[PDB]
Symmetry: D3
Subunit: 175 residues, 6 copies
C-alpha cells in the first residue's frame, strides 16, 4: 500500500510524491491517515479558493511540523488522489504557520514521465505567475479559519529544497 | 487500509463513514469488497437517476441486512470514493427492501471538518427538499431492476439513528 | 437576444439576471459585450480563487460604476453562461473599488423556479458561511492585479438592494 | 440567431433540433425564450434525476401543447445548450401531461454528422434499455412537483413521428 | 450578435477570435452558422482525439479555403463556445487539406487579458511539445473519415501569420 | 488490497479487471505498482488523444510482454481508477510493440452488473466504429514518444481471447 511507498529512487533528486489533493479541485482538504493508508477528509475549506498545483507528501520523511515534507507538483492534467508521482525537487516556499516552519517544496514531474519540465531546474525557472499564485494561496486559504495564521516568508532554491529532503528523511529514519 | 478504519472516535455520535459513491455522480453503484478492501463495481444503474448525497458505510458494523450500516452524507462538494469522512448521525430513513430492514442513516460532516452543518442536529433540521429527494431516490432507483422492490416507510430521529449504530456495532463485535 | 432581455417582470422584487460567470468555474472573467450581445473574455484571473456563486447583471440598469447592477445568484447547480435567471433581491455587498461604489447584490432564484430559497428573504437569512466567502472573494480576487484595489465595506438588507434596482433602472431609462 | 433556424433541410426526415438541455447534465430545465432567443432557466428539478439524452425542439413547429415539438437526441458526447443538431426522426413517446398530448420524438444524429446511428431507422432499432430509461424519466421527473402529472402511454414508430413533424410544421405556418 | 463581432481592434496584431471549440473537450466539431450566428454540430469525430487548444475563427475574413481564418488559442483554462477572445497572432501551421491551403494560425491571449503569454512573440517561443501536439492532431484527426486527407507542411512565423490576416481581411472586404 | 484480487470467478469467461485508466480521461497513463498496490503515474502522454474505453489488467496473469493481460472495457459511464470490474472477454487486438506480442483484450461488463452488453458475444458484435477507434488509438498514442513503435496486426475472436487468459494465468501460477 501507500505506507510502503519509497521516499524516492535516489534521494534527494529522484523522489516519490504521494498525491492527496489534485490541481484545480473543489476546496476539500484530504490527507492520508498514516495509521491505515486511507484518504481522510481533513476539512472542507470555507474560502472560495482551490489548490493551484497537486499537493502531497514524500513518505518516510519528517519535517519540522510533525508530518512528512509537503510537496506541490505542477502537471499538465490533474492527478488522482492516492496516486504516486516521480518528481525532481526544484524549490521551496518558506512559511511559518501554527506548527512553525511548514515549508512546501515545489517538485516537477521527472524526465521519465514527461519532457515538459526539463528546462525547469531551480526556482527562477518556474513561471513568475505560478510562484505568486501558490504564495497567495498559502497566504490566504485559512483566512476564514479561526485559530489559523501563516507568515509566508519567501522562496528558496533547489538545494535549499534538497537539504530539507535529506534532513527530513534522516530525521525519520532515526526513529 | 480501509478494512482497518475504526467505526468512529466516539460511538455513536462521532463515527467514520467510508464513502463508496460520491454525490452527483453517474449512475454506477460501487461497494468495498470486504475481502480485499478494493472498490468493486456492483452494477450500472439503468435508471436516469443519481445519488443525491455521498453514500457509504460505517465499518465494523452489521445491520439487519447483512452489511454495515449504510450512511448518506450531504457535503458542500462531492467526496472521493474510498475516502473516509468524520460525521455525526442526525436521522434515518426506514425502508424494507428484499433484505428486509435496510435503513439508511443520514450523517453530516462533524464540527471539526466544517462549521456548516452545526445547526442540523436532528431530522427536522435537514431541509425538507433534501429529505424528499433521498426518499424519492430510494423509492425509485431500482425500478428498472427486475427482482428489486422497496417500501420506503418514513424518517426517524437522531437517537433512532444512534441506537442502530450501537446495535449494529455490538452485533458485529460478538462474532 | 440578450440585449432585449427585460430588467424583470416586476421591479424591483421580480428581476431577470443575465449570467456571465457560473458558480465554481475556472478563474475566467466573462462579460457580455453591450455592443453585440456576445460573451467576451475580460481577463484570466491570476489568483487561485473561483466565483462562489453565479455572477451576472440586471439588463437596462446603470449603477454608479458605469455598468448594469452586478448580481450574485446562489443556485443548487451551476447555470450556463448567457442564460437568464428569474430572481428576487435579498441583500447587497457594499464595496468601493477603482470605479467607486460598485455594489454587488445577492439575489436568489424566484419561487417559481424552485422552492428552496423561499425562507431567505433578507441578508440575515443567507447562511453566515456564504456571506464571508463572497466578502472574502471580493476582498481578494484582484490581489495579483496591479492597479486594482477594493474596500469591502459591509452587507446591506433587501430594501437597500431594492432601492439600488429602481435607482439604477431609472438612471438608465433617462438616457 | 436561434429564432431564425430552419425547421430542417428536408422535412420531415432531415430536421434541425435546437438543444436546450444536454445529456447527463445537472437537473436544471432550460428553455429558449421565443421572444429574445435567450436560454432561460425554467426551474431547478427537485428530483435526483437527469436527462437521459439531449433535449430540445424543432423550430417553426407548434405541437398540441402550445410549444414546438420536443425532441430527445441520443449522441456520443453531450452537446451544448443553444447549439443546433441535424437529425433524422426515428420514433415518438406518447404521453399526456397537464398540457394534454405532449409527445417527445426521439431523433438521431443525421448520417452526415456521424455514421454511428445509421442502423437505427425506427423505434425497434433503439436499444431496449434506452427506451425504458427515457420512459421512466418522463414518468417520474415531476414527482416532487405539486400540480404536475404525466400518463406515459407508449412508444410510436418513425412515420408516427414524421406525421407529427408535418402537422406541427403546417399548424405553425398557418399563423 | 456573433456576426457583428469586429475582426480585431487593430489588425493584424490585435484581433478577436470567436471560439467554436474549447480546449480539452469531447470530440465534437462545432461551427458558427454564418447565416444565423448559431453554433451547429458539424460532426462527431470518430477518433479518440481532442482539440489541444481552443479553436475558432477571425470574423470578417476569408482565407483560401472559403471560410474565415482558423485560429488555435492556447489558454490557462478552457473557454466557452460562442465566447470571443482578444488575441495577438504568433505563428501559423501550413497545411493543405481537401480545400487546399487551410492554414491554422496560433494566437495567444492579448496582454490586457493575462500577462502569461507576453514572452511568446513568435513560433520559436511556443513550447516544442505544444507545436508537435497540434501538428499531430491536424495530421490525424480525420483518419477515420473517408474522403478526408491532410498534408501538414510546417510551421511559419508571426508576420507570415499577420500577412494571412490582412490578405484574408482584405479579400472579404472587397465583396 | 488490489494485489489480492482474484483473476476471476470462473476463468476464462468470468474474470475481474482492475481499472487503471478510465474512459475519456485526460492523457495520463497510470499503472498499479505490483510491489505496493499503489496507482503510479507512468507518463503524461504528449499526444492529444484519450483512452476510448477503460483500461486495466487481469491480476495473477502474465502475458508475453512481462505484465498481466491488458484489458479494455467499454462501459456506460467511466469507472474509477483502482476499482475492479466483473467482465466477460469478447475479443483481442493483436499488436506487437517494443515488448513483442502485447495483445489487448476487449472485455464487456458481465451480465450481473448490467444487461446492456448481453448481445455482444464475440468481436463481430462490437460496433465497427469502436473497433477502429481503439485500433487507431493503439496505432498512434506513442507517436510523439521516441523509442516507441507499434504494429497493430488485427482483431481476434472471443476464444482467441479466452486462450490468452488461461495461458497467461497458467504461466503466472507456475512461478
Ligand atoms: Mn507541513
Ligand atoms: Mn443495507
Ligand atoms: Mn459594478
Ligand atoms: Mn410538449
Ligand atoms: Mn480553413
Ligand atoms: Mn502488454
Amino acid at each position: 500500500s501507500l505506507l510502503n511507498v519509497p521516499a524516492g529512487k535516489d534521494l534527494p533528486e529522484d523522489i516519490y510524491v504521494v498525491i492527496e489533493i489534485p490541481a484545480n479541485a473543489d476546496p476539500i482538504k484530504y490527507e492520508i491517515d498514516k495509521e491505515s493508508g486511507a484518504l481522510f477528509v481533513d476539512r472542507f475549506m470555507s474560502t472560495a479558493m482551490f489548490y493551484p498545483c497537486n499537493y502531497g507528501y514524500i513518505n518516510h520523511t519528517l519535517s519540522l511540523d510533525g508530518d512528512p515534507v509537503d510537496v506541490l507538483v505542477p502537471t499538465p492534467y490533474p492527478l488522482q488522489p492516492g496516486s504516486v508521482i516521480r518528481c525532481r525537487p526544484v524549490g521551496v516556499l518558506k512559511m511559518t504557520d501554527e506548527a512553525g516552519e511548514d515549508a512546501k517544496l515545489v517538485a516537477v514531474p521527472h524526465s521519465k514521465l514527461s519532457k515538459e519540465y526539463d528546462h525547469i531546474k531551480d526556482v527562477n525557472d518556474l513561471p513568475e505567475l505560478l510562484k505568486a499564485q501558490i504564495a497567495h494561496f498559502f497566504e490566504h486559504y485559512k483566512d476564514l479559519e479561526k485559530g489559523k495564521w501563516v507568515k509566508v516568508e519567501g522562496w528558496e532554491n533547489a538545494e535549499a529544497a534538497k537539504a530539507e529532503i535529506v534532513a527530513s528523511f534522516e530525521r525519520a529514519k532515526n526513529k
